[PDB]
RNA sequence: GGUUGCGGCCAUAUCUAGCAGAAAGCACCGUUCCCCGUUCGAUCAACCGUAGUUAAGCUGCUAAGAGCAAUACCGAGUAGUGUAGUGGGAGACCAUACGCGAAACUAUUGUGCUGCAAUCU
RNA sequence: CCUAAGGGGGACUCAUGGAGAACAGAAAUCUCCAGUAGAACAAAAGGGUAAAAGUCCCCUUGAUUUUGAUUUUCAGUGUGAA
RNA sequence: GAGGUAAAGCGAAUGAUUAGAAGUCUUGGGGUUGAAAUGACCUUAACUUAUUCUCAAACUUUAAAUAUGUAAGAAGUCCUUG
C-alpha cells in the first residue's frame, strides 16, 4: 500500500493566526484589538513583552501585541480576503521548511472593512499553519506521538497546493 | 553553521523514560499515589477502579497491584452491554453508568456480598455512598483510577463512578463532578443527573433534532430508526438493562470461533522474521561486490 | 571555618545513579516489611523526607517499627569503646530487604530436607559447611597436549 | 624573579591547574608546539624520533620553550626548515606557587609559573622526518636534552611518522587502500557503520 | 469586551536582555550604499 | 501468534532513514442539542459508530546504521594496590617476594522479555 | 527573605537553535520543527526535580492544638535543626 | 550490601587545550570584478563536519587494592489453631 494519493493525506488549513504587534500599550493596542475582533469576530488576546528593550521602547510584561487564531471556513475566508490585497502573488521565500506560509498586509482597510478616523489604520500579519489529517496525534494528551515523515508537510507540497487551490503565483 | 544536535554523545547519555511513560499511557505520579498501601496493612491490597474510554469501548476493571504486575479482580466492558439490552451508544454517559453498575454487581457476586450491599435499587440521582451494615462485613472498597483523562464536571468516567457506587461498591467520591452540579449554588440537581443516567440527554437530542434537521437525524440516529426506537422508549432500554444487569451480572465469555492454536497459526503467517546473521552477512558481501 | 552540617560530604553518596534519575519504580512501594526483617539502608537523593543520616548509608539493620510510609531500623554504632543501639526512622524508598536472609533461609530448608531423608534411609548426612580443601591427586594426559616450552622474551621498545 | 628550577623539580603537590578557583595565573612561556613542516603529509616523513622521559618530574614552561627553540634552530640550520615536523608532546598545565613574592602565617602562595608533570616513559618531543635525516634530528634532540632536568632518552620509533601503526602495518594498510590523507594526518578504514559511506570514502579498498 | 492575555510559558525570571542579541552580528542593511 | 486495558523490570525497549501490515483491536475520522473548557469544539467536554481511511499513530522487518546490552587465550595479569627486607639508587624513583587486581582498547554476539484480564481469520 | 517564595489540586514545558510572517532590523510579537534539561527552583555551594519540585491558574492557612519517641553535633548533656 | 580514593577517560558530559584538512558564510572583513546588479572570485578570520597533541583537589561514563555494614539458627525451622 502506502499510497500518496490517499484521502487522508489531503492538505488543508489547520489555523490562521492574525498578529498586530503595536509597539505600545493603551489606546492604540485597544483599538488594534478592536480591529482584530472586527475582522475575526472573536475576542483577541494581548501578548506581553518577554523582556525590556530601550531601543524598541518596550518593557517586560508590558502588553505589546494582540493576536487571534481562526480555524475552519472563517480562516479560509479571511485568508482569501488577505490574498486579494496581495493580488494572489506570494514569494518562494514565504513558505517555511515545515510547510507553513504567511504574508503581511500594510493597511487593514484594504481587506474590506469600514474605516474610522478614531481607530486609524493598523497593519496586520497573516500566518497559515498547514496540516493533513491526524495531527491530533501530536496534540492529544494520551499516547501523544510524532507524525511520520511521508505525512509531514513541507515547503514544496504547500507551494504546489497553494498554486492549485488559489490559481496564484509563488515568485521564485 | 549550527552544531548538529543528535550526536552519539547525545544518545549515549540519554535516559529513556519508563516504557509505559514513553508510550504516554501511565501517569506514574498518580499511579504511585493510588497504588502505595499503608505499610502496617502489610499484604492487604488497594483495589483500583480502572476506567478507560476508547473510541468504541468502555473498559472498567477492578485491579490490585503486585510486583510481577497488576492483577485483575473482575472486568466489565461496554461491548458486553448488548447482552443486557443496550446495543447502541456503547459510549454514552449512560453506557458508562451501565458498565459501572455491571462491574460493581459482578465484583460483589465474586466476593459474595450480593444480598448485603445491594446498592441504590431505585436510581433517583441523589448523591450517596455505600454505608456499611452494622455487625457485618464492610463494603468492598474501590478507588477510581481515571488515568490521564481530565477531571471535568460531566465527564463520562464519573458515570462509571456513579454506576459502581449505586451497584454496591464503596467508592469514595464527591458529587461536584457529576452532570447537574451547580458550582455557584453548591448543590447537585439530582433531576438532571437522573436524566443523564437513563439517556435523557440523548433522547432530548433525538427529539430536538427530529423536528429541526431531519436529514442529520437520519444519519446520526440511524440504528434507532431501523430499530424503531423513539425518544420516549429510550429510557426503558437503560431502565430494563439495570434490572437485567442486576439479575445476572456473571461474566459470559464470547464463544470463540477458533481455538488459541488456530489463531496463533493464522497470525504467524503475516509476521516477518528476522534475518539470520549469515543472511545479512551475505547481503553485505553482495552489496560490496556490486560496488566493485 | 569548619562546616559540619547534616549532609556535609554527601556529594556523591546521595547522587542518583547515572541514567537512573527521576521517578522511583513502584516495586519499592510494593515491598512488605515486617518487624524482624533485615534491611539495607541506601539513601535515595530524590526523596528528602525520611532520609537517613550519612552514617547509616550503607548499613544493615533490623526492622523494629512499621508506620504508614516508613520503617524503624535498629543499628549498632561504635561510640568509643562500646556499641550504642540507634533507632532510625526511614521511608521505604531508602530501604531494601537484605539478600543475606534469603540465602541462609534456604540453607535452613535444605538442611531440614536432607536430614529427614537420611532418617528415612536410616543413614547419616553432614550439614556443616566446609571451607575449600586442597585438591586431590590427578593424572594429566598429554595426547594432543605435549608441553610447550616458554622462555622470557628479550627487551624491546614499542614506541 | 625566577627561583632556580630545583625548587620546583618534583611532583610534590596535587595538580593545580587554572580554574574558577585560581584565576590570576600567568601564561606559559611555550605557545607553539608544532614546528617545521607541520603541513607535510604522512607519507613524506616516515621516520619518528622521540625524546622520552626517564623521570617522574616537573618541567617548567621555560625549559620546554628553551628546548623547543634549541632543537628547531639546530635542525633548520643543518637540514632546512621543511625537512622535519617537530611536536612538543607535554603542555604545562600545573601552576607553581611562590610565597615570599608574617613568616609562615598565611603562607599560601601566589601563582608563579607553569610546569608539565611528566612520568617515566612519557614522550616529551616527537620529530617526524625522512630516514636520511636521522642523524640530524637525533642531534637536534640531543641538544634539547641539555635544557631539561633529569634523564631523557632519544628513542627511534618503530612506527610510521606520528601514526599508531608500525612501519610495516602502515604499508600493508596503504597498499590495501585502507588509509586516506587528512592533511598532516590520515584516516583509516572502518569495518563498522554505513557500508556505502565507507566504500565511497575509501574507493581503493580491496575487500577480502 | 473581554481581555484575555497570553500566558507565560518561559522560566526566565530575570528582567534583562535576552540571549543572542549582539551588535555587529547583523549584515549591512545599507550595503547597496 | 496479533490486539487492547492495567502493569513489572526500565533503551537488548531509545534514535535516524526506509518498507510491509490479513482478522480484530487501537487509531485517525464525523457532529455541536446537552454537561463542560477555550482567542480558537485545535486541546479538553459531550454526541453518533453513523459518512470515510490504513495516510499517520501503533506493530513488525530492513541498515558492514548511531546508541545501548552481554561476552572474552582482547588489552592485561598491564595500570593501581595490601604486606616485606640493614633491597637498588645522591635523589627522583625502581626492582624483587607473598597476595588482590582495573579502565580504556580490540573482537564477537544480540536489539525487549514478561504478569493478569479481555478479545481475534 | 517569603501570606506566598507555605499547603493541596489542575493544566503546561524549560534554555537554546533552525525555518518562516507589514513596519520589524542582531534584540519587540506571531507560527512550526528540533530541543535529557544545555532552564528555573529567594539568597553560598553541592545534591534533587520534566504529564515536576520548574511556569501559569483555582482553593486555602497544617506556618494550627496536646504532649511523648527518634537522628545529627553528643558527655549519647543542653541549644539549634530535622 | 555500601563507597567514588588509586588507576583510567577526554574521536564520553563540564572545564582547559595543540595542529592541520574538507565544507558554509546566506548572518566578517580586505582586494579584484561591475558605467550600477550583493549576485561570483583571491585572501585571512569565523563557524560546521570528521580527525589530531595534551590535562583536572574543588571534572567524569567506568572503577580497584586496603579498610567497612550485616548473616552463618534452639530466642531456629515447620504443622495445627488461640
UniProtKB/Swiss-Prot annotation, chain A:
One of its GO terms (molecular function) is structural constituent of ribosome. It is found in: Cytoplasm. GO terms for biological process: translation. Keywords: Cytoplasm, Ribonucleoprotein, Ribosomal protein. Signal peptide: none annotated. Transmembrane segments: none annotated. Component of the large ribosomal subunit. Mature ribosomes consist of a small (40S) and a large (60S) subunit. The 40S subunit contains about 32 different proteins and 1 molecule of RNA (18S). The 60S subunit contains 45 different proteins and 3 molecules of RNA (25S, 5.8S and 5S). Belongs to the universal ribosomal protein uL5 family. Component of the ribosome, a large ribonucleoprotein complex responsible for the synthesis of proteins in the cell. The small ribosomal subunit (SSU) binds messenger RNAs (mRNAs) and translates the encoded message by selecting cognate aminoacyl-transfer RNA (tRNA) molecules. The large subunit (LSU) contains the ribosomal catalytic site termed the peptidyl transferase center (PTC), which catalyzes the formation of peptide bonds, thereby polymerizing the amino acids delivered by tRNAs into a polypeptide chain. This is Large ribosomal subunit protein uL5. It comes from Candida albicans (strain SC5314 / ATCC MYA-2876) (Yeast).
From Swiss-Prot, chain B:
Its main location: cytoplasm. One of its GO terms (biological process) is ribosomal large subunit assembly. SUPFAM superfamilies: Translational machinery components (SSF53137). InterPro entries: Rbsml_uL18_euk, Ribosomal_uL18_C_euk. GO terms for cellular component: cytosolic large ribosomal subunit. GO terms for molecular function: 5S rRNA binding; structural constituent of ribosome. Transmembrane segments: none annotated. The keyword Ribonucleoprotein applies. Gene3D superfamilies: 3.30.420.100. Keywords: Cytoplasm, Ribonucleoprotein, Ribosomal protein. It is found in: Cytoplasm. Belongs to the universal ribosomal protein uL18 family. Component of the ribosome, a large ribonucleoprotein complex responsible for the synthesis of proteins in the cell. The small ribosomal subunit (SSU) binds messenger RNAs (mRNAs) and translates the encoded message by selecting cognate aminoacyl-transfer RNA (tRNA) molecules. The large subunit (LSU) contains the ribosomal catalytic site termed the peptidyl transferase center (PTC), which catalyzes the formation of peptide bonds, thereby polymerizing the amino acids delivered by tRNAs into a polypeptide chain. Component of the large ribosomal subunit. Mature ribosomes consist of a small (40S) and a large (60S) subunit. The 40S subunit contains about 32 different proteins and 1 molecule of RNA (18S). The 60S subunit contains 45 different proteins and 3 molecules of RNA (25S, 5.8S and 5S). This is Large ribosomal subunit protein uL18. The lineage of its organism: Eukaryota, Fungi, Dikarya, Ascomycota, Saccharomycotina.
Curated annotation (Swiss-Prot), chain C:
The keyword Nucleus does not apply. Gene3D superfamilies: 6.10.250.3260, Ribosomal protein L21. GO terms for cellular component: cytosolic large ribosomal subunit. It is found in: Cytoplasm. Its main location: cytoplasm. Keywords: Cytoplasm, Ribonucleoprotein, Ribosomal protein. InterPro entries: Ribosomal_eL21 (IPR001147), Ribosomal_eL21_CS (IPR018259), Ribosomal_eL21_sf (IPR036948), Translation_prot_SH3-like_sf (IPR008991). GO terms for molecular function: structural constituent of ribosome. Pfam families: Ribosomal_L21e. GO terms for biological process: translation. The keyword Translocase does not apply. Component of the ribosome, a large ribonucleoprotein complex responsible for the synthesis of proteins in the cell. The small ribosomal subunit (SSU) binds messenger RNAs (mRNAs) and translates the encoded message by selecting cognate aminoacyl-transfer RNA (tRNA) molecules. The large subunit (LSU) contains the ribosomal catalytic site termed the peptidyl transferase center (PTC), which catalyzes the formation of peptide bonds, thereby polymerizing the amino acids delivered by tRNAs into a polypeptide chain. Component of the large ribosomal subunit. Mature ribosomes consist of a small (40S) and a large (60S) subunit. The 40S subunit contains about 32 different proteins and 1 molecule of RNA (18S). The 60S subunit contains 45 different proteins and 3 molecules of RNA (25S, 5.8S and 5S). Belongs to the eukaryotic ribosomal protein eL21 family. This is Large ribosomal subunit protein eL21. The gene is RPL21A.
From Swiss-Prot, chain E:
It comes from the Eukaryota. It is found in: Cytoplasm. Phosphorylation by TORC1 upon nutrient replenishment inhibits STM1 and causes its release from dormant ribosomes. Belongs to the STM1 family. Associates with mature 80S ribosomes. Binds to the head domain of the 40S ribosomal subunit and prevents mRNA binding by inserting its alpha-helix domain towards the mRNA entry tunnel at the decoding site, where it blocks the binding of tRNA and mRNA at the A- and P-sites. Interacts with eEF2; interaction sequesters eEF2 at the A-site of the ribosome, thereby blocking the interaction sites of the mRNA-tRNA complex, promoting ribosome stabilization and hibernation. Ribosome preservation factor that protect a small pool of nontranslating, vacant ribosomes in cells under nutrient starvation conditions. Under nutrient-limiting conditions, cells reduce ribosome biogenesis and degrade ribosomes via autophagy (ribophagy) or proteasomal degradation. To avoid excessive degradation during starvation, STM1 binds to and protects 80S ribosomes from proteasomal degradation. Under nutrient-sufficient conditions, TORC1 phosphorylates and inhibits STM1 to prevent formation of dormant 80S ribosomes. This is Ribosome-associated protein STM1. The gene is STM1. The chain holds residues 22 to 54 of 267 of the full protein.
Amino acid at each position: 500500500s502506502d499510497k500518496s494519493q490517499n484521502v487522508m493525506r489531503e492538505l488543508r488549513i489547520e489555523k490562521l493566526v492574525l498578529n498586530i504587534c503595536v509597539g505600545e500599550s493603551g489606546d492604540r493596542l485597544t483599538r488594534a484589538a478592536k480591529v482584530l475582533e472586527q475582522l475575526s469576530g472573536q475576542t483577541p488576546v494581548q501578548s506581553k513583552a518577554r523582556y525590556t528593550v530601550r531601543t524598541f521602547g518596550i518593557r517586560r510584561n508590558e502588553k505589546i501585541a494582540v493576536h487571534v487564531t481562526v480555524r475552519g471556513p472563517k480562516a479560509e475566508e479571511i485568508l482569501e480576503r488577505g490574498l486579494k490585497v496581495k493580488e494572489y502573488q506570494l514569494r518562494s521565500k514565504n513558505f517555511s521548511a515545515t510547510g507553513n506560509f504567511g504574508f503581511g498586509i500594510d493597511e487593514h482597510i484594504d481587506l474590506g472593512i469600514k474605516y474610522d478616523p478614531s481607530i486609524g489604520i493598523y497593519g496586520m500579519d497573516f500566518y497559515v499553519v498547514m496540516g493533513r489529517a491526524g495531527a491530533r496525534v501530536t496534540r492529544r494528551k494520551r499516547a501523544r506521538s510524532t507524525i511520520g515523515n511521508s505525512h509531514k508537510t513541507n515547503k514544496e507540497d504547500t507551494i504546489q497546493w497553494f498554486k492549485t487551490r488559489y490559481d496564484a503565483e509563488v515568485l521564485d | 553553521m549550527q552544531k548538529e544536535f543528535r550526536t552519539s554523545a547525545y544518545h549515549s547519555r540519554f535516559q529513556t523514560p519508563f516504557r509505559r511513560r514513553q508510550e504516554g499511557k501511565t501517569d506514574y505520579y498518580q499511579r504511585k499515589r493510588l497504588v502505595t498501601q499503608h505499610k502496617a496493612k502489610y499484604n492487604s491490597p488497594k483495589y483500583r477502579l480502572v476506567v478507560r474510554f476508547t473510541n468504541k469501548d468502555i473498559i472498567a476493571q477492578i485491579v490490585s497491584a503486585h510486583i510481577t504486575g497488576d492483577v485483575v479482580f473482575t472486568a466489565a466492558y461496554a461491548h458486553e452491554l448488548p447482552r443486557y439490552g443496550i446495543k447502541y451508544g456503547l459510549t454514552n454517559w449512560s453506557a458508562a453508568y451501565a458498565v459501572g453498575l455491571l462491574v460493581a454487581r459482578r465484583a460483589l457476586q465474586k466476593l459474595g456480598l450480593d444480598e448485603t450491599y445491594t446498592g441504590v435499587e431505585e436510581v433517583e440521582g441523589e448523591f450517596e455512598l455505600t454505608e456499611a451494615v452494622e455487625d457485618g462485613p464492610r463494603p468492598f472498597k474501590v478507588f477510581l483510577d481515571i488515568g490521564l483523562q481530565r477531571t471535568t464536571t460531566g465527564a463520562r468516567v464519573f458515570g462509571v463512578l456513579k454506576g459502581a457506587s449505586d451497584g454496591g461498591l464503596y467508592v469514595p467520591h464527591s458529587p461536584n463532578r457529576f452532570p447537574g452540579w451547580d458550582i455557584e449554588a453548591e448543590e447537585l440537581d439530582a433531576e438532571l443527573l437522573r436524566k443523564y443516567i437513563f439517556g435523557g440527554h440523548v433522547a432530548e437530542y433525538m427529539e430536538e433534532l427530529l423536528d429541526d434537521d431531519e436529514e442529520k437525524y437520519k444519519s446520526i440516529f440511524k440504528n434507532y430508526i431501523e430499530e424503531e426506537i423513539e425518544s420516549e422508549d429510550v429510557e426503558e432500554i437503560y431502565a430494563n438493562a439495570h434490572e437485567a444487569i442486576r439479575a445476572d451480572p456473571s461474566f459470559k465469555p464470547t464463544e470463540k470461533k477458533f481455538t488459541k492454536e488456530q489463531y496463533k497459526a493464522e497470525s504467524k503467517k503475516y509476521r516477518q522474521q528476522k534475518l539470520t546473521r549469515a543472511e545479512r552477512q551475505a547481503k553485505v558481501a553482495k552489496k560490496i561486490a556490486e560496488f566493485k | 571555618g569548619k562546616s559540619r552540617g547534616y549532609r556535609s560530604g554527601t556529594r556523591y553518596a546521595f547522587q542518583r545513579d547515572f541514567k537512573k534519575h527521576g521517578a522511583i519504580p513502584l516495586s519499592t512501594y510494593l515491598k512488605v516489611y515486617k518487624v524482624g526483617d533485615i534491611v539495607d539502608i541506601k539513601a535515595n537523593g530524590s526523596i528528602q523526607k525520611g532520609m537517613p543520616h550519612k552514617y547509616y548509608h550503607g548499613k544493615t539493620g533490623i526492622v523494629y517499627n512499621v508506620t504508614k510510609s516508613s520503617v524503624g531500623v535498629i543499628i549498632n554504632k561504635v561510640v568509643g569503646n562500646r556499641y550504642i543501639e540507634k533507632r532510625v526512622n526511614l521511608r521505604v524508598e531508602h530501604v531494601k530487604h537484605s539478600a543475606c536472609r534469603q540465602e541462609f533461609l534456604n540453607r535452613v530448608k535444605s538442611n531440614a530436607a536432607k536430614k529427614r531423608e537420611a532418617k528415612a534411609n536410616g543413614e547419616t548426612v553432614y550439614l556443616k559447611r566446609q571451607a575449600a580443601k586442597p585438591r586431590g591427586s590427578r593424572i594429566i594426559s598429554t595426547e594432543g597436549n605435549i608441553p610447550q616450552t616458554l622462555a622470557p622474551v628479550a627487551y624491546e621498545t614499542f614506541i | 624573579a625566577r627561583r632556580p628550577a630545583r625548587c620546583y623539580r618534583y611532583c610534590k603537590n596535587k595538580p593545580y591547574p587554572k580554574s574558577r578557583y585560581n584565576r590570576a595565573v600567568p601564561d606559559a612561556k611555550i605557545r607553539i608546539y608544532d614546528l617545521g613542516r607541520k603541513k607535510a603529509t604522512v607519507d613524506e616523513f616516515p621516520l619518528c624520533i622521540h625524546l622520552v622521559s626517564n623521570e617522574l618530574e616537573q618541567l617548567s614552561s621555560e625549559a620546554l620553550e628553551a628546548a623547543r627553540i634549541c632543537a628547531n634552530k639546530y635542525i633548520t640550520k643543518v637540514s632546512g626548515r621543511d625537512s622535519f615536523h617537530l611536536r612538543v608532546r607535554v603542555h604545562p598545565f600545573h601552576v607553581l606557587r611562590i610565597n615570599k613574592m608574617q613568616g609562615m602565617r598565611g603562607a599560601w602562595g601566589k601563582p608563579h609559573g607553569l610546569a608539565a608533570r611528566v612520568s617515566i616513559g612519557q614522550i616529551i618531543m616527537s620529530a617526524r622526518t625522512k630516514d636520511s635525516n636521522k642523524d640530524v634530528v637525533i642531534e637536534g634532540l640531543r641538544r634539547a636534552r641539555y635544557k631539561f632536568p633529569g634523564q631523557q632518552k632519544i628513542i627511534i620509533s618503530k612506527k610510521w611518522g606520528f601514526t599508531p601503526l608500525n612501519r610495516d602495518e602502515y604499508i600493508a594498510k596503504k597498499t590495501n587502500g585502507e588509509v586516506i590523507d587528512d592533511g598532516a594526518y590520515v584516516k583509516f578504514l572502518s569495518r563498522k557503520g554505513n557500508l556505502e559511506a565507507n566504500l565511497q570514502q575509501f574507493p581503493n579498498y580491496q575487500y577480502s | 469586551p473581554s481581555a484575555p492575555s497570553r500566558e507565560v510559558v518561559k522560566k526566565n525570571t530575570s528582567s534583562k536582555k535576552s540571549d543572542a542579541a549582539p551588535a555587529s552580528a547583523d549584515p549591512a542593511k545599507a550595503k547597496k550604499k
